[PDB]
Ligand binder design. Structure first.
Ligand SMILES: CCC1=C(C)/C(=C/C2=NC(=C\c3[nH]c(/C=C4\NC(=O)[C@H](C)[C@H]4CC)c(C)c3CCC(=O)O)/C(CCC(=O)O)=C2C)NC1=O
Ligand SMILES: CCC1=C(C)/C(=C/C2=NC(=C\c3[nH]c(/C=C4\NC(=O)[C@H](C)[C@H]4CC)c(C)c3CCC(=O)O)/C(CCC(=O)O)=C2C)NC1=O
Ligand SMILES: CCC1=C(C)/C(=C/C2=NC(=C\c3[nH]c(/C=C4\NC(=O)[C@H](C)[C@H]4CC)c(C)c3CCC(=O)O)/C(CCC(=O)O)=C2C)NC1=O
Ligand SMILES: CCC1=C(C)/C(=C/C2=NC(=C\c3[nH]c(/C=C4\NC(=O)[C@H](C)[C@H]4CC)c(C)c3CCC(=O)O)/C(CCC(=O)O)=C2C)NC1=O
Ligand SMILES: CCC1=C(C)/C(=C/C2=NC(=C\c3[nH]c(/C=C4\NC(=O)[C@H](C)[C@H]4CC)c(C)c3CCC(=O)O)/C(CCC(=O)O)=C2C)NC1=O
Ligand SMILES: CCC1=C(C)/C(=C/C2=NC(=C\c3[nH]c(/C=C4\NC(=O)[C@H](C)[C@H]4CC)c(C)c3CCC(=O)O)/C(CCC(=O)O)=C2C)NC1=O
Ligand SMILES: CCC1=C(C)/C(=C/C2=NC(=C\c3[nH]c(/C=C4\NC(=O)[C@H](C)[C@H]4CC)c(C)c3CCC(=O)O)/C(CCC(=O)O)=C2C)NC1=O
Ligand SMILES: CCC1=C(C)/C(=C/C2=NC(=C\c3[nH]c(/C=C4\NC(=O)[C@H](C)[C@H]4CC)c(C)c3CCC(=O)O)/C(CCC(=O)O)=C2C)NC1=O
Ligand SMILES: CCC1=C(C)/C(=C/C2=NC(=C\c3[nH]c(/C=C4\NC(=O)[C@H](C)[C@H]4CC)c(C)c3CCC(=O)O)/C(CCC(=O)O)=C2C)NC1=O
Ligand SMILES: CCC1=C(C)/C(=C/C2=NC(=C\c3[nH]c(/C=C4\NC(=O)[C@H](C)[C@H]4CC)c(C)c3CCC(=O)O)/C(CCC(=O)O)=C2C)NC1=O
Ligand SMILES: CCC1=C(C)/C(=C/C2=NC(=C\c3[nH]c(/C=C4\NC(=O)[C@H](C)[C@H]4CC)c(C)c3CCC(=O)O)/C(CCC(=O)O)=C2C)NC1=O
Ligand SMILES: CCC1=C(C)/C(=C/C2=NC(=C\c3[nH]c(/C=C4\NC(=O)[C@H](C)[C@H]4CC)c(C)c3CCC(=O)O)/C(CCC(=O)O)=C2C)NC1=O
Ligand SMILES: CCC1=C(C)/C(=C/C2=NC(=C\c3[nH]c(/C=C4\NC(=O)[C@H](C)[C@H]4CC)c(C)c3CCC(=O)O)/C(CCC(=O)O)=C2C)NC1=O
Lengths: 161, 70, 279, 162, 160, 172, 48, 68, 162, 162
């Protein structure tokens, strides 16, 4: 994976460039937002379970999805689905701390679209589950962090569609 | 004669004859295989305005129109 | 006589009068040693002089990228054209190239040959462009490339057969099918042949040839790998008689690329019952 | 989307050519013209509410029968979808004003117009009359080159519908 | 980075970051501007550090620039200092990342094999990096020189 | 194709709204700086050949392997293809610069380009570098031209750079 | 094994490269032939 | 009773191992459904590339006869 | 012949379409810019010849072997045909200035340039150096947007020759 | 790659046809001609070193000014890249001799020549003069049909550059 500090180094290494003024400006733009990323992660982590619960309640359950014939019918599959939800939340929190989406590609999106096609897992319904968790997250983390958390949920959801 | 079987409507049945003389446009030397700039096309009535439009669009000069079917 | 903040000042003991590091900066000089080596010339360093005719590591040998993709006879394709007052062998060579290109390397049997158009093309009453239009409106083209495929496969096959290149964007397909529904297949075939791309390139006597493997003016850079997907080998063809008769290629997931935002956020969650009290 | 900028770029690209003085002169026109265009845009934007209600009503006043029962100017849903539709037109007019060309109108209202109107039994006459009315009132919200711009695009819609 | 190393632990246990993990990211990022200054100073004096490193190296072991030496000649020497320039660059990367991930993948995993193949004395080479540290440590004020020095001593550490 | 206004319009429409006073003034500012923009596009057009040539000379100065047999800018045919691609990319960067939006560059030039080069065996890192050199020289020209009124073009120089940097990133 | 436990279909799965050696080993670990002979008679601590 | 049939490419990036290893890195293997969530994570945490997946065995429907 | 006017008309015609506000905005650019263009034109027009004799000589001063016997800058006829040729270029530059586009340059000098120069053993370098010199002196005959225009077209010729 | 063999095969293939007596007669020409061709090839091959140094120098002797400072025949790198380039030409001449056609010349030197030379400010005149000189000296290394072959290909390059 890579993060904003690391990406700047590998992007320059392949050109064999010392870090120069443009590089140093990018890294500053990361460091200067760093404390806010940490606070936001502590809110998400400590509200993890409630975010999933409120996101499922707005976007998944009370529906045909949870009824016989639906993909989150059976305690087995309901458990698998909210298990997935926890992955998304947790990794988006990593991406937002790192200030780089590369981890969402390497460890979450790669092959996932076809995995879901192969099992029958409804993609559009999963995206709504992602964009509902974003909605909840953006309330909990506040002005400071709302836009920055949000983008990696949006990265996740356009990665499936 | 012409291209032969046309569309089945009566307005496709009428074919006309156009003798042209295409001119070198501008902007560019043609070094490919060139043809003598006279020629003639037989066009059905249903098509005719695109064909005359692209003929006069490329600096061409329509020399004669002839009623060959009708 | 000015500002406080000259406070950047080094604090060592300064050198004595003959130290070895007063004439240090002049000691880097004008010889052939470690200080002679030009610093910025370190990156462009070679072998022990390897002079100028050592081959590059990983040699390629021109027309091997064509040989790797197998597009050697096609990139660039040779230009076949009906000269005025041609003989019989010239016309047979032109007819063979027409049947190879327009009918997409599928084979015509001896019963399927459009014979009575050729008596005229040998007369000279029609040109090669009119002959291509007459073939593409006939049942030979219609049964193979239109009669068993969807509109996307048919529109992209028109671009390969008539124009020799791949579809450039989604707007080329959404324009052509609107014309098909509005005006039928006969105006649809004429839309390719009366286009500016045909009239500029192929003219009136040049058999359509493959152009999608070189660069053409006003192209999208997705036009090449789409043409690689459309190509399918030198001994390949756009035949239907296989197990999947004309499944689509270059799917409109290719033509529009990334997506950004939306999933329909629908409610199969449920709502209803009402009692009152006690809370 | 057709603007002066996209048009000159399209024409350069299609000849495999850098933008030259011909194309940059063209662009200057579009930029010089932005002030009048954008004044029209701001006036049409803030008056939108009333321009729409004015034109909606005028469709019923010119076609009285539309508002009788069994007709297409009757009931909340028809009258609602009408206001919306005129609002769509004014919206794209402002967009065309701001964009420096007819693109927004061409892509979002003109392409497909007749097929849609014909399937849904919507007469262009209403829409022309909505626009003729909007044109009457915009006579006193603007003047000079902002009015000419507003007019250019209103008239463009009326010709699209005839 | 510290992030890359640590998040990896989060994802591998299928969880959000710990208070501890969050704290170290915070302390780390607070130490950013200083680390950036340490890299700047050294980037700014790179040519001096390399050459003075190169003199310090060939005194402590010259034989390499002699008839049967790996670096004998003008263009066999143009490559040895270039390698010293490479490692100083990686040291600036490491200092701004706060760990070796980048330094390691780029220039130690596969090296020793690499140097060995070419038949360069590996200890000759670590002198040279250790020599570069000295020239560079001297173009920095006492606080920044130490911060830089950790990354020089890391490379010296890895190459052996 | 999009330009900076068209982009605004598409985002507004997705809200179902007339342009925000926010967006209006952002576009009023683009009109404000448009003479400078025209000079910036003109700087590139007026030196296109030298920008490509100078980038080229320097690319092969650095990477002498490309002009050896076995190398991807050898023989004349391949060098002409490489010179042609340098021109094509500089061309779409200038279009983006007139437009105030990268889309023409991304849609007509960058989309699929990397995969083309890999299929061909064209070393993408070398192509990325050729783009970095064009950027240096192009901006050079944007900043130091013939009797243009003195002022600050750094905003436009940045924006031009991001178009060069998009292309580089997309290709490497 | 005197043509015992073995792997009917297990051998064809491992060869054919349908299954990889790690996988085959994992199948072998959870099987009756294994449970009996190594877990059939032992408290919970030496079997681990 | 459900077996996926994945395909991956994992490239060693921490050691330069010296003998063999071709099949270690580019291989096709049906892996049972119970374990495929971990095998995929393991491929991903090694910088692997998951090229293909399939259902292979099970019906892609469910509820009875799946979790056996 | 490429001008802003011909370009917009060409684009309308090719879509079977009346000129609309997009195209008329473009035309206004060309008309608004005529004053600067035509001032450049008048200045370049009256201060003319000497530019040719200056550039001709400079070709020989930069390529001395040129004015030596057996060479192509020697004898009345070569030196005469040179002045003429630079005069052709300046003439078409003024035409392009007046016309509002590169058309005159494209049609009368660019189309065919290399084939001709190659058959007749004429090096572009001379012509670039003639034009570079003309560009130096035009720095003090004009300023502001007339100079930018003059420059645009001189540079256009230099790129045509590289 | 154009040879007599590839040409006749191409012509057969494109008519969907087996090679016939017409095509085999053609091939016999190419095979009968190999002896003279390959003698030219061997002579050009072993004299390469001096043919190249002879032609390189002649470029400077005919264009004296090239070797002055600030010029393109000055410094080790220009003079090195020149020798190399003439060496490329002689190399492809020998290849064309051995191959039985112009293919190697067409594919590796002719395709793209002018674009490259124009971007890099390389005058064909030098290269023609290099080749004219090589042609002078090859007059006494060969004779009869080997000389005619050598000439055929040298002249082919000179026409490619005019
Ligand atoms: C056939 C396998 C199967 C089961 C069992 C199942 C249960 C299930 N119970 C639910 C809710 C619920 N279930 C209960 C049940 C209870 N409340 C209590 O305090 C008691 C302990 C208990 C009643 C005995 C309640 C109160 C809710 C609403 C919880 C909420 O909305 O937050 C929901 C979410 C609502 C929905 O979308 O349907 C599901 C899916 N789903 C399944 O697929
Ligand atoms: C570490 C990164 C990572 C992710 C994200 C991941 C996803 C993932 N989801 C799976 C299944 C599943 N995923 C879901 C998900 C849902 N069901 C719905 O209806 C909703 C739309 C949605 C929840 C919002 C369900 C129901 C299954 C079970 C399918 C089955 O019965 O086989 C499986 C198959 C193996 C298993 O069942 O555990 C994987 C690997 N695996 C990973 O390694
Ligand atoms: C079949 C082989 C073939 C021939 C022979 C041929 C001749 C031919 N010469 C043409 C033009 C031309 N030919 C010339 C030739 C001359 N001008 C002079 O003053 C001289 C007396 C003479 C040169 C010696 C010129 C100047 C034109 C362009 C006329 C114009 O567009 O105004 C054209 C019009 C198309 C074009 O301009 O490309 C044709 C078809 N085309 C062919 O395909
Ligand atoms: C529109 C439908 C249509 C017709 C009617 C048609 C007639 C036609 N007959 C032709 C030749 C011919 N037609 C004949 C016919 C005859 N020879 C005799 O001695 C008899 C009197 C007569 C048979 C009853 C012959 C022999 C030729 C070949 C002439 C030659 O090439 O020497 C040709 C010249 C092209 C070719 O040979 O294919 C045309 C165009 N072409 C058409 O496309
Ligand atoms: C072989 C016969 C044939 C079919 C069936 C066909 C389907 C088809 N529908 C298309 C677009 C479309 N189809 C629709 C249809 C709908 N939109 C909705 O929201 C509704 C759910 C639905 C109407 C009931 C729309 C909106 C587009 C345009 C999509 C776009 O460009 O954004 C396109 C892309 C080309 C184009 O836009 O013309 C094809 C090929 N084409 C064919 O040639
Ligand atoms: C590049 C040169 C080239 C080759 C080699 C070529 C092969 C080729 N063979 C084809 C069909 C065919 N090929 C055969 C051949 C056979 N059937 C048998 O049972 C035998 C085992 C075998 C004969 C020995 C048959 C029967 C078909 C028709 C399949 C069908 O339509 O059902 C097709 C589909 C198009 C068509 O039917 O014309 C191609 C492209 N095409 C080419 O352009
Ligand atoms: C983006 C640009 C855009 C336009 C312009 C547009 C027009 C449009 N008007 C429609 C319907 C309608 N339009 C009207 C119009 C009117 N009713 C009245 O009271 C008046 C007579 C008149 C207003 C002047 C009515 C009544 C309907 C409902 C038609 C139906 O479904 O029966 C519909 C059908 C879908 C729907 O029912 O909403 C479209 C697409 N849609 C678009 O997306
Ligand atoms: C949409 C606009 C557009 C672009 C950008 C484009 C790129 C492009 N570059 C190509 C080839 C090429 N591109 C290069 C470029 C280079 N070689 C090097 O070594 C350098 C690193 C680099 C120059 C900086 C070369 C050498 C080839 C020929 C490869 C071959 O045939 O072996 C080709 C194959 C077709 C052809 O050779 O004409 C395409 C499509 N085509 C387009 O239509
Ligand atoms: C033919 C198409 C066309 C062009 C090219 C054009 C250029 C143009 N550039 C202008 C100003 C200017 N142009 C620049 C540009 C620069 N300043 C610098 O120091 C940099 C080196 C350079 C950065 C790009 C500046 C600073 C001004 C004055 C401020 C302004 O008007 O915005 C002006 C206003 C009049 C003036 O002050 O001279 C015009 C008309 N107008 C046109 O119609
Ligand atoms: C549990 C379900 C299951 C089945 C059915 C199965 C079949 C199967 N048959 C195989 C080979 C084979 N199968 C046969 C079968 C036959 N030879 C003949 O000539 C006859 C027509 C036929 C017997 C009637 C032969 C000869 C081989 C060996 C092929 C070889 O030499 O590689 C293999 C390759 C691995 C191996 O050699 O064991 C498998 C997996 N595998 C399974 O896991
Ligand atoms: C026993 C038979 C066998 C072979 C041959 C084999 C090759 C092989 N080469 C690999 C990687 C590689 N191979 C190379 C090879 C080269 N790099 C270059 O630039 C040169 C062109 C070329 C050397 C001449 C490189 C650089 C990698 C590392 C790719 C990476 O970073 O992931 C890998 C991936 C796993 C690993 O990194 O070890 C395998 C399996 N594996 C085998 O089991
Ligand atoms: C309408 C636009 C137009 C241009 C630009 C043009 C160029 C042009 N220059 C020519 C010749 C010439 N051009 C020159 C040029 C020069 N001699 C010198 O002393 C200098 C080195 C140099 C000036 C910089 C010379 C010497 C010739 C005579 C070439 C010959 O016939 O040998 C000729 C050959 C016909 C002739 O001999 O006049 C053309 C067509 N012709 C045109 O119709
Ligand atoms: C495979 C066939 C092939 C040919 C023919 C070829 C020509 C060729 N000559 C070049 C440069 C050059 N060519 C020369 C030529 C000369 N300098 C002198 O002293 C003399 C005047 C003259 C020799 C007669 C010079 C000086 C350069 C350097 C140009 C530069 O980069 O500035 C370059 C640019 C890349 C590079 O700098 O090497 C090419 C491609 N390249 C090829 O791949």
């Amino acid at each position: 994976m890579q993060d904003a500090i690391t990406a700047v180094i590998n992007n320059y290494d392949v050109q064999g460039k010392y870090l120069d003024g443009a590089a140093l400006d990018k890294l500053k733009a990361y460091f200067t937002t760093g404390a806010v990323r940490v606070r936001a992660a502590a809110v998400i982590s400590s509200n993890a379970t409630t975010i999933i619960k409120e996101a499922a309640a707005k976007a998944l359950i009370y529906s045909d999805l949870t009824r016989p014939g639906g993909n989150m019918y059976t305690t087995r599959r309901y458990a698998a689905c909210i298990r997935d939800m926890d992955y998304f939340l947790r990794y988006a929190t990593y991406a937002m701390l790192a200030g780089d989406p590369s981890i969402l590609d390497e460890r979450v999106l790669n092959g996932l679209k076809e995995t879901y096609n192969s099992l029958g897992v409804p993609i559009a319904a999963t995206v709504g589950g992602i964009q509902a968790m974003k909605e909840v997250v953006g309330g909990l983390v506040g002005p400071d962090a709302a836009k920055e958390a949000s983008i990696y949920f949006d990265y996740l959801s356009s990665g499936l569609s | 004669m012409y291209n032969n079987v046309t569309a089945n409507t009566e307005w496709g049945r009428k074919v006309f004859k156009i003798t042209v003389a295409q001119f070198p446009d501008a902007d560019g030397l043609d070094t490919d295989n060139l043809s003598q700039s006279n020629y003639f096309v037989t066009v059905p009535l249903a098509r005719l305005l695109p064909e005359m439009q692209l003929i006069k669009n490329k600096g061409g000069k329509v020399l004669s129109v002839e009623p060959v079917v009708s | 006589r000015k500002v406080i903040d000259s406070i950047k000042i080094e604090d060592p003991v300064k050198p004595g009068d003959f130290a070895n590091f007063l004439d240090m900066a002049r000691g880097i000089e004008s010889r052939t040693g470690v200080w002679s080596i030009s610093y910025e010339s370190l990156r462009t360093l070679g072998p022990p002089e390897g002079g100028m005719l050592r081959p590059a590591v990983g040699g390629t040998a021109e027309a091997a990228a064509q040989k790797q993709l197998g597009i050697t006879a096609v990139a660039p394709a040779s230009v076949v054209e009906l000269r005025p007052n041609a003989s019989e062998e010239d016309l047979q060579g032109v007819l063979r190239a027409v049947y190879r290109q327009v009918l997409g390397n599928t084979y015509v049997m001896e019963s399927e040959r459009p014979t009575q158009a050729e008596s005229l093309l040998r007369n000279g009453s029609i040109s090669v462009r009119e002959f291509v239009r007459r073939i593409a409106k006939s049942d030979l083209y219609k049964e193979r490339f239109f009669n068993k495929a969807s509109n996307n496969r048919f529109i992209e096959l028109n671009f390969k057969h008539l124009l020799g290149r791949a579809p450039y964007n989604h707007g080329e397909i959404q324009e052509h099918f609107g014309l098909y529904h509005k005006a039928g297949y006969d105006v649809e075939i004429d839309s390719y042949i009366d286009s500016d791309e045909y009239i500029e390139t192929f003219g009136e006597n040049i058999v359509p040839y493959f152009r999608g493997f070189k660069y053409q003016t006003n192209q999208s850079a997705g036009g090449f790998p789409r043409m690689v997907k459309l190509w399918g080998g030198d001994a390949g063809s756009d035949t239907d008689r296989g197990k999947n008769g004309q499944r689509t290629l270059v799917t409109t997931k290719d033509l529009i690329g990334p997506t950004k935002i939306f999933v329909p956020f629908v409610a199969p969650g449920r709502d209803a019952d009402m009692v009152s009290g006690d809370y | 989307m057709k603007t002066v900028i996209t048009e000159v770029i399209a024409s350069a690209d299609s000849q495999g050519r850098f933008l030259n003085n011909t194309e940059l002169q063209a662009a200057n026109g579009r930029f010089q013209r932005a002030t009048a265009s954008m004044e029209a845009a701001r006036a049409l934007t803030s008056n939108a509410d009333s321009l729409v209600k004015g034109a909606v009503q005028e469709v019923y006043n010119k076609f009285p029968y539309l508002t009788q029962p069994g007709q297409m100017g009757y009931g909340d849903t028809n009258q609602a979808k009408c206001a919306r539709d005129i609002s769509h037109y004014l919206r794209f007019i402002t967009y065309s004003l701001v964009a420096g060309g007819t693109g927004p109108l061409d892509d979002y209202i003109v392409a497909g117009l007749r097929e849609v109107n014909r399937t849904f039994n919507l007469s262009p006459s209403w829409y022309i009359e909505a626009l003729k009315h909007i044109k009457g009132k915009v006579g006193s919200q603007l003047s000079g080159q902002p009015l000419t711009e507003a007019n250019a695009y209103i008239d463009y819609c009326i010709n699209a519908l005839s | 980075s510290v992030l890359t190393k640590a998040i990896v632990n989060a994802d591998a246990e299928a969880r959000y970051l710990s208070p501890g993990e969050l704290d170290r990211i915070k302390s780390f990022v607070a130490s950013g501007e200083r680390r950036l200054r340490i890299a700047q100073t050294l980037t700014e004096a790179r040519e001096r550090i390399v050459k003075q490193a190169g003199d310090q190296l060939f005194q402590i072991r010259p034989d390499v620039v002699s008839p049967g030496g790996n670096a004998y000649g003008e263009k066999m020497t143009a490559l040895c200092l270039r390698d010293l320039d490479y490692y100083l660059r990686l040291v600036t990367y490491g200092i701004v990342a706060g760990d070796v991930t980048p330094i390691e993948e780029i220039g130690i995993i596969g090296v020793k094999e690499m140097y060995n193949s070419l038949q360069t004395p590996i200890p000759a080479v670590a002198e040279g990096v250790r020599a570069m540290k000295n020239v560079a440590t001297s173009l920095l004020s006492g606080d920044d020189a130490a911060e830089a020095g950790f990354y020089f001593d890391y490379l010296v550490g890895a190459m052996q | 194709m999009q330009d900076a206004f068209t982009k605004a319009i598409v985002a507004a429409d997705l809200r179902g709204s007339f342009l925000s006073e926010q967006e209006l003034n952002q576009l009023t500012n683009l009109v404000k700086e448009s003479n400078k923009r025209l000079d910036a596009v003109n700087a590139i057009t007026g030196n296109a050949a030298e920008i490509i040539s100078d980038a080229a000379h320097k690319l092969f100065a650095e990477q002498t392997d490309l002009i050896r047999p076995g190398g991807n800018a050898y023989p004349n045919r391949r060098m002409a293809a490489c010179l042609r691609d340098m021109e094509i990319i500089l061309r779409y960067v200038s279009y983006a610069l007139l437009a105030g939006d990268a889309s023409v560059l991304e849609d007509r030039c960058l989309n699929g380009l990397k995969e083309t080069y890999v299929a061909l065996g064209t070393p993408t890192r070398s192509v990325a570098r050729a783009v970095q050199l064009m950027k240096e020289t192009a901006i050079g020209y944007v900043n130091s031209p013939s009797g243009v009124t003195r002022g600050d073009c750094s905003a436009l120089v940045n924006e031009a750079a991001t178009y060069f940097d998009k292309a580089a990133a997309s290709i490497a | 094994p005197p043509s015992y436990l073995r792997l009917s279909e297990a051998e064809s799965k491992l060869k054919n490269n349908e299954i990889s050696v790690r996988e085959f080993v994992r199948r072998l670990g959870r099987s009756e032939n294994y449970r009996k002979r190594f877990f059939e008679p032992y408290s919970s601590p030496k079997v681990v | 009773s459900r077996y996926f049939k994945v395909t991956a490419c994992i490239p060693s990036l921490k050691r330069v191992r010296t003998g063999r290893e071709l099949q270690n890195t580019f291989f096709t293997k049906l892996v049972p459904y119970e374990n495929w969530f971990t095998e995929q994570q393991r491929i991903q945490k090694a910088g692997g590339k998951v090229l293909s997946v399939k259902l292979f065995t099970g019906v892609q429907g469910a509820n009875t006869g799946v979790g056996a």
